[PDB]
Amino acid sequence: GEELKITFILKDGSQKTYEVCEGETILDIAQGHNLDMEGACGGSCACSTCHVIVDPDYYDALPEPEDDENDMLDLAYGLTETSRLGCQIKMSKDIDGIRVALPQMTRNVNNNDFS
Ligand code: FES
């Protein structure tokens, strides 16, 4: 088929560069691949860890969320000019070489496990 990819900047600063399909979501790849990362949305009724930021190349085409939706971003440290929403934007033909950064996360309160 046409093929696509996603780069994530790790909470460890590393780059990881993953082959995915169209219509896949960014927190959904991050925890679906179990990147070396912090977050909890992959658990059963656990979805409140929406926090990513984009490359200014692949943002420049992207929409802005509601005040309850963009709050799920703010929960991670150091929110930026190109912050993006982990269950509200996905891979399409225009993404072919996209990046995001995976920010450090304040509090998720799972004690032992989310999955
Ligand atoms: S990925 Fe869970 S709040 Fe968006």
Short mmCIF file of N, CA and C and ligand atoms in Angstrom, two decimals:
data_model
loop_
_atom_site.label_atom_id
_atom_site.label_comp_id
_atom_site.label_asym_id
_atom_site.label_seq_id
_atom_site.Cartn_x
_atom_site.Cartn_y
_atom_site.Cartn_z
N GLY A 1 0.84 -1.21 0.00
CA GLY A 1 0.00 0.00 0.00
C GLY A 1 0.86 1.25 0.00
N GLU A 2 0.27 2.41 0.30
CA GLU A 2 0.96 3.72 0.25
C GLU A 2 2.05 3.92 1.32
N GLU A 3 1.86 3.31 2.50
CA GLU A 3 2.66 3.40 3.73
C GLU A 3 2.85 4.82 4.33
N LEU A 4 2.95 4.90 5.66
CA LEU A 4 3.13 6.13 6.45
C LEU A 4 4.10 5.88 7.63
N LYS A 5 4.54 6.94 8.33
CA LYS A 5 5.32 6.85 9.58
C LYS A 5 5.03 8.00 10.56
N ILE A 6 5.35 7.79 11.84
CA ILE A 6 5.25 8.73 12.97
C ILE A 6 6.58 8.73 13.73
N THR A 7 7.14 9.91 14.00
CA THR A 7 8.23 10.06 14.98
C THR A 7 7.70 10.62 16.28
N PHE A 8 8.10 10.01 17.38
CA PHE A 8 7.90 10.53 18.72
C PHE A 8 9.25 10.84 19.35
N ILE A 9 9.34 12.02 19.96
CA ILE A 9 10.41 12.36 20.91
C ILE A 9 10.01 11.77 22.26
N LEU A 10 10.85 10.92 22.84
CA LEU A 10 10.59 10.23 24.10
C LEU A 10 10.64 11.19 25.30
N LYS A 11 10.04 10.81 26.44
CA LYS A 11 10.36 11.46 27.73
C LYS A 11 11.82 11.27 28.19
N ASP A 12 12.52 10.35 27.54
CA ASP A 12 13.97 10.11 27.65
C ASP A 12 14.79 10.91 26.60
N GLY A 13 14.15 11.81 25.83
CA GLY A 13 14.76 12.66 24.80
C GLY A 13 15.04 11.99 23.44
N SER A 14 15.03 10.66 23.40
CA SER A 14 15.26 9.82 22.21
C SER A 14 14.24 10.03 21.10
N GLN A 15 14.56 9.58 19.89
CA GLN A 15 13.69 9.57 18.71
C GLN A 15 13.36 8.16 18.32
N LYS A 16 12.07 7.96 18.10
CA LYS A 16 11.55 6.68 17.71
C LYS A 16 10.47 6.84 16.68
N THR A 17 10.68 6.05 15.65
CA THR A 17 10.28 6.35 14.29
C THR A 17 9.60 5.13 13.68
N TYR A 18 8.26 5.14 13.69
CA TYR A 18 7.41 3.94 13.68
C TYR A 18 6.49 3.91 12.46
N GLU A 19 6.37 2.75 11.82
CA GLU A 19 5.56 2.55 10.62
C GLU A 19 4.11 2.19 11.00
N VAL A 20 3.14 3.02 10.59
CA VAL A 20 1.72 2.94 10.97
C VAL A 20 0.79 3.10 9.77
N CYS A 21 -0.49 2.81 9.96
CA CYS A 21 -1.53 3.05 8.97
C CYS A 21 -2.25 4.40 9.18
N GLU A 22 -2.99 4.81 8.15
CA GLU A 22 -3.89 5.96 8.15
C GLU A 22 -5.08 5.77 9.13
N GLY A 23 -5.58 6.86 9.74
CA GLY A 23 -6.68 6.83 10.71
C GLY A 23 -6.27 6.43 12.14
N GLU A 24 -5.02 6.02 12.36
CA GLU A 24 -4.46 5.77 13.70
C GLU A 24 -4.22 7.10 14.45
N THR A 25 -4.52 7.13 15.75
CA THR A 25 -4.45 8.32 16.61
C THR A 25 -3.13 8.38 17.38
N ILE A 26 -2.68 9.55 17.84
CA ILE A 26 -1.29 9.73 18.32
C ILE A 26 -1.05 9.16 19.72
N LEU A 27 -1.94 9.39 20.70
CA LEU A 27 -1.84 8.69 22.00
C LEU A 27 -2.09 7.19 21.82
N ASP A 28 -2.95 6.85 20.87
CA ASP A 28 -3.26 5.48 20.48
C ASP A 28 -2.07 4.73 19.88
N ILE A 29 -1.16 5.38 19.14
CA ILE A 29 0.13 4.78 18.74
C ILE A 29 1.10 4.81 19.92
N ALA A 30 1.14 5.89 20.70
CA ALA A 30 2.11 6.02 21.78
C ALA A 30 1.99 4.89 22.82
N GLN A 31 0.78 4.68 23.34
CA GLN A 31 0.50 3.56 24.24
C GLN A 31 0.18 2.25 23.53
N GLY A 32 -0.35 2.26 22.30
CA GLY A 32 -0.53 1.02 21.53
C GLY A 32 0.80 0.35 21.17
N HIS A 33 1.87 1.13 21.00
CA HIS A 33 3.22 0.60 20.79
C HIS A 33 4.03 0.47 22.08
N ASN A 34 3.51 1.01 23.19
CA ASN A 34 4.23 1.14 24.46
C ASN A 34 5.64 1.73 24.25
N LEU A 35 5.64 2.95 23.72
CA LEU A 35 6.81 3.85 23.76
C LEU A 35 7.34 3.98 25.21
N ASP A 36 8.64 4.25 25.39
CA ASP A 36 9.24 4.48 26.72
C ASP A 36 8.80 5.87 27.23
N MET A 37 7.70 5.86 28.00
CA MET A 37 6.78 6.99 28.11
C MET A 37 5.97 6.96 29.42
N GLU A 38 5.31 8.07 29.76
CA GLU A 38 4.34 8.16 30.87
C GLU A 38 2.97 8.68 30.39
N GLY A 39 1.90 8.11 30.94
CA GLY A 39 0.51 8.20 30.45
C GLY A 39 -0.32 6.97 30.89
N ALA A 40 -1.65 7.01 30.72
CA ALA A 40 -2.55 5.96 31.25
C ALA A 40 -3.80 5.65 30.40
N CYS A 41 -4.10 6.45 29.36
CA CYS A 41 -5.28 6.32 28.51
C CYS A 41 -5.53 4.92 27.90
N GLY A 42 -4.49 4.10 27.74
CA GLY A 42 -4.60 2.70 27.28
C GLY A 42 -5.28 1.73 28.26
N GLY A 43 -5.54 2.14 29.51
CA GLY A 43 -6.27 1.34 30.51
C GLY A 43 -7.79 1.31 30.32
N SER A 44 -8.50 0.49 31.10
CA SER A 44 -9.96 0.36 31.01
C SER A 44 -10.67 1.54 31.68
N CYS A 45 -11.39 2.35 30.90
CA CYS A 45 -11.95 3.65 31.32
C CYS A 45 -10.91 4.57 31.99
N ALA A 46 -9.80 4.83 31.30
CA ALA A 46 -8.62 5.53 31.83
C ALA A 46 -8.23 6.80 31.05
N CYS A 47 -9.07 7.25 30.12
CA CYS A 47 -8.69 8.20 29.09
C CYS A 47 -8.74 9.66 29.58
N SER A 48 -7.59 10.19 30.00
CA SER A 48 -7.38 11.61 30.38
C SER A 48 -5.91 12.07 30.28
N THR A 49 -5.11 11.43 29.43
CA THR A 49 -3.65 11.64 29.28
C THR A 49 -3.27 12.06 27.85
N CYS A 50 -3.97 13.06 27.31
CA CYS A 50 -4.04 13.37 25.88
C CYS A 50 -2.85 14.12 25.26
N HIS A 51 -1.71 14.17 25.94
CA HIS A 51 -0.75 15.26 25.81
C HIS A 51 0.38 14.95 24.82
N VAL A 52 0.38 15.69 23.71
CA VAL A 52 1.43 15.73 22.68
C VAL A 52 1.63 17.15 22.17
N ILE A 53 2.72 17.35 21.45
CA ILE A 53 3.03 18.55 20.69
C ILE A 53 3.62 18.15 19.33
N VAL A 54 3.31 18.89 18.28
CA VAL A 54 3.70 18.65 16.89
C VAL A 54 4.90 19.47 16.42
N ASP A 55 5.54 18.96 15.38
CA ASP A 55 6.35 19.74 14.45
C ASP A 55 5.53 20.92 13.86
N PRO A 56 6.04 22.17 13.86
CA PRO A 56 5.43 23.28 13.13
C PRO A 56 5.14 23.04 11.64
N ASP A 57 5.72 22.02 11.00
CA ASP A 57 5.35 21.61 9.63
C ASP A 57 3.97 20.95 9.60
N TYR A 58 3.72 19.98 10.48
CA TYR A 58 2.53 19.17 10.41
C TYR A 58 1.40 19.71 11.29
N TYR A 59 1.67 20.69 12.17
CA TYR A 59 0.64 21.53 12.82
C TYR A 59 -0.10 22.44 11.90
N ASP A 60 0.55 22.87 10.82
CA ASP A 60 0.15 24.16 10.25
C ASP A 60 -1.20 24.05 9.50
N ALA A 61 -1.67 22.80 9.45
CA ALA A 61 -2.88 22.26 8.84
C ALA A 61 -3.93 21.82 9.89
N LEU A 62 -3.59 21.90 11.18
CA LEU A 62 -4.33 21.26 12.29
C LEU A 62 -5.29 22.22 13.04
N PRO A 63 -6.46 21.73 13.50
CA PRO A 63 -7.48 22.48 14.25
C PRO A 63 -7.13 22.70 15.74
N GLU A 64 -7.92 23.49 16.47
CA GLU A 64 -7.78 23.79 17.91
C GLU A 64 -8.98 23.23 18.75
N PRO A 65 -8.78 22.56 19.91
CA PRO A 65 -9.86 21.90 20.67
C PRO A 65 -10.64 22.83 21.62
N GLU A 66 -11.70 22.29 22.25
CA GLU A 66 -12.40 22.96 23.36
C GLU A 66 -11.54 23.13 24.62
N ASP A 67 -11.96 24.03 25.51
CA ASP A 67 -11.33 24.31 26.81
C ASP A 67 -11.24 23.10 27.77
N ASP A 68 -12.10 22.09 27.64
CA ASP A 68 -11.99 20.82 28.37
C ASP A 68 -11.07 19.82 27.68
N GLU A 69 -10.89 19.98 26.37
CA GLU A 69 -10.11 19.08 25.54
C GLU A 69 -8.62 19.47 25.58
N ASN A 70 -8.29 20.75 25.34
CA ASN A 70 -6.95 21.33 25.52
C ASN A 70 -6.43 21.39 26.97
N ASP A 71 -7.30 21.19 27.96
CA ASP A 71 -6.89 21.01 29.37
C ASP A 71 -6.16 19.68 29.57
N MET A 72 -6.55 18.62 28.85
CA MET A 72 -5.93 17.28 28.88
C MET A 72 -4.47 17.30 28.38
N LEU A 73 -4.07 18.41 27.73
CA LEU A 73 -2.72 18.72 27.28
C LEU A 73 -1.88 19.36 28.39
N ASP A 74 -2.41 20.45 28.96
CA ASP A 74 -1.88 21.24 30.08
C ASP A 74 -1.39 20.42 31.29
N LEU A 75 -1.93 19.21 31.46
CA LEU A 75 -1.59 18.25 32.52
C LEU A 75 -0.16 17.71 32.40
N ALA A 76 0.43 17.83 31.21
CA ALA A 76 1.84 17.59 30.95
C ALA A 76 2.67 18.88 30.96
N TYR A 77 3.91 18.80 31.43
CA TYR A 77 4.80 19.95 31.59
C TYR A 77 5.10 20.66 30.27
N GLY A 78 5.05 21.99 30.31
CA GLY A 78 5.74 22.80 29.32
C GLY A 78 5.03 22.88 27.97
N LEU A 79 3.69 22.96 27.97
CA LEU A 79 2.83 23.06 26.78
C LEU A 79 3.21 24.22 25.84
N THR A 80 3.20 23.95 24.53
CA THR A 80 3.82 24.79 23.48
C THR A 80 2.83 25.33 22.44
N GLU A 81 3.35 26.23 21.61
CA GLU A 81 2.80 26.83 20.39
C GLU A 81 2.10 25.86 19.42
N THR A 82 2.50 24.59 19.43
CA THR A 82 2.02 23.53 18.54
C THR A 82 1.47 22.32 19.31
N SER A 83 0.95 22.52 20.53
CA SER A 83 0.37 21.44 21.30
C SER A 83 -0.80 20.77 20.57
N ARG A 84 -0.91 19.44 20.64
CA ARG A 84 -1.91 18.65 19.92
C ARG A 84 -2.49 17.52 20.76
N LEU A 85 -3.70 17.12 20.37
CA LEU A 85 -4.61 16.34 21.19
C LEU A 85 -4.64 14.86 20.77
N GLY A 86 -4.27 14.00 21.71
CA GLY A 86 -3.81 12.63 21.46
C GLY A 86 -4.86 11.67 20.90
N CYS A 87 -6.13 11.86 21.25
CA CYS A 87 -7.27 11.11 20.69
C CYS A 87 -8.10 11.91 19.68
N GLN A 88 -7.70 13.15 19.33
CA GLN A 88 -8.46 14.03 18.44
C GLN A 88 -7.72 14.40 17.14
N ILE A 89 -6.48 13.94 16.92
CA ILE A 89 -5.86 13.99 15.58
C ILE A 89 -5.08 12.72 15.22
N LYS A 90 -5.12 12.37 13.93
CA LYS A 90 -4.73 11.08 13.37
C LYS A 90 -3.95 11.19 12.07
N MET A 91 -3.33 10.07 11.69
CA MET A 91 -2.57 9.92 10.45
C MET A 91 -3.48 10.05 9.21
N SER A 92 -3.06 10.81 8.21
CA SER A 92 -3.69 11.03 6.89
C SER A 92 -2.60 11.17 5.82
N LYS A 93 -2.91 11.22 4.51
CA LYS A 93 -1.86 11.25 3.46
C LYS A 93 -0.87 12.43 3.55
N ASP A 94 -1.25 13.50 4.26
CA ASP A 94 -0.47 14.73 4.43
C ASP A 94 0.57 14.64 5.56
N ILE A 95 0.57 13.56 6.34
CA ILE A 95 1.42 13.37 7.52
C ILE A 95 2.73 12.67 7.20
N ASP A 96 3.02 12.34 5.94
CA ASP A 96 3.99 11.29 5.60
C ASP A 96 5.44 11.70 5.93
N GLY A 97 5.80 11.50 7.20
CA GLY A 97 7.05 11.96 7.84
C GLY A 97 6.88 12.87 9.08
N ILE A 98 5.66 13.00 9.61
CA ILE A 98 5.26 13.72 10.83
C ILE A 98 6.09 13.36 12.06
N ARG A 99 6.20 14.34 12.96
CA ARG A 99 6.74 14.20 14.31
C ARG A 99 5.76 14.74 15.31
N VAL A 100 5.85 14.20 16.51
CA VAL A 100 5.42 14.87 17.72
C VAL A 100 6.46 14.70 18.83
N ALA A 101 6.39 15.52 19.88
CA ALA A 101 7.15 15.29 21.10
C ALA A 101 6.22 14.78 22.20
N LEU A 102 6.69 13.81 22.98
CA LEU A 102 5.95 13.19 24.07
C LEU A 102 6.44 13.84 25.40
N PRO A 103 5.64 14.74 26.01
CA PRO A 103 6.06 15.52 27.17
C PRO A 103 6.03 14.71 28.47
N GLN A 104 6.72 15.21 29.50
CA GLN A 104 6.72 14.62 30.84
C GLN A 104 5.41 14.94 31.59
N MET A 105 4.91 13.98 32.37
CA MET A 105 3.53 13.95 32.88
C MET A 105 3.47 14.07 34.41
N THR A 106 2.67 15.02 34.92
CA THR A 106 2.64 15.38 36.35
C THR A 106 2.04 14.31 37.27
N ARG A 107 0.81 13.86 37.01
CA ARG A 107 0.04 12.94 37.87
C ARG A 107 -1.06 12.21 37.10
N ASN A 108 -1.09 10.88 37.25
CA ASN A 108 -2.04 9.97 36.61
C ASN A 108 -2.77 9.04 37.61
N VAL A 109 -2.25 8.89 38.83
CA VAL A 109 -2.82 8.15 39.97
C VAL A 109 -3.42 6.79 39.62
N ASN A 110 -2.53 5.84 39.31
CA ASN A 110 -2.85 4.42 39.08
C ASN A 110 -2.26 3.48 40.15
N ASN A 111 -1.39 3.99 41.03
CA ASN A 111 -0.66 3.32 42.11
C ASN A 111 0.27 2.16 41.66
N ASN A 112 -0.27 1.13 41.02
CA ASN A 112 0.44 -0.09 40.62
C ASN A 112 0.40 -0.36 39.10
N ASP A 113 -0.77 -0.26 38.48
CA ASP A 113 -0.94 -0.49 37.04
C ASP A 113 -2.17 0.23 36.48
N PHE A 114 -2.11 0.54 35.18
CA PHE A 114 -3.27 0.86 34.34
C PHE A 114 -3.56 -0.24 33.31
N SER A 115 -2.58 -1.11 33.01
CA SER A 115 -2.68 -2.24 32.06
C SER A 115 -1.64 -3.32 32.34
S1 FES B 1 -5.96 10.03 24.39
FE1 FES B 1 -7.10 9.97 26.26
S2 FES B 1 -7.88 11.95 26.72
FE2 FES B 1 -7.17 11.83 24.65
#
